[PDB]
Amino acid sequence: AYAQWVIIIIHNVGSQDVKIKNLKASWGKLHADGDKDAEVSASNYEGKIVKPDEKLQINASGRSDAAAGTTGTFDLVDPADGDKQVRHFYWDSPWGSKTNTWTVSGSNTKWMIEYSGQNLDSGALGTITVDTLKK
Ligand code: NA
């Protein structure tokens, strides 16, 4: 359902490009900013470069009137290092479960990543802002 939703905002706060890769929603839809009825393909974001101080926004929700939520993953990768993984990201805003999940994994000590805004207890996962910086 549309009540299961997440907004992921990637903000590059450093001086080196970061890149989005392997964006895949396993449950639900990706949709346009502020319009859950406008479903969009992950190719609108796949491989996109986020330049210094730029931002990129992904919106995902459950499908309308579906007893199912939104679940997906994506990578941030380093376009100056052979698209080496920076971090791996997983989101889940389930239907009928009170625990939402936002999990960052992987390791790359040249990069630092900070996120906030998530809601883990009941309802939608919320609007998560992810700051990236190459050290
Ligand atoms: Na949810």
Curated annotation (Swiss-Prot):
GO process annotations (BP): symbiont-mediated hemolysis of host erythrocyte
Q: Which UniProt key words apply to this protein?
A: Cytolysis, Hemolysis
Q: Which Pfam families match?
A: Aegerolysin
Q: Which residues form a coiled coil?
A: none
The record's listing under InterPro entries reads: Aegerolysin-typ
Q: What does this protein do?
A: Has hemolytic activity against bovine erythrocytes at nanomolar concentrations in vitro. Promotes active pleurotolysin B (PlyB)-dependent permeabilization of membranes rich in cholesterol and sphingomyelin. May play an important role in the initial phase of fungal fruiting.
Q: Which family does it belong to?
A: Belongs to the aegerolysin family.
Quaternary structure note: Monomer.
Q: What is this protein called?
A: Ostreolysin A6
Annotated source species: Pleurotus ostreatus
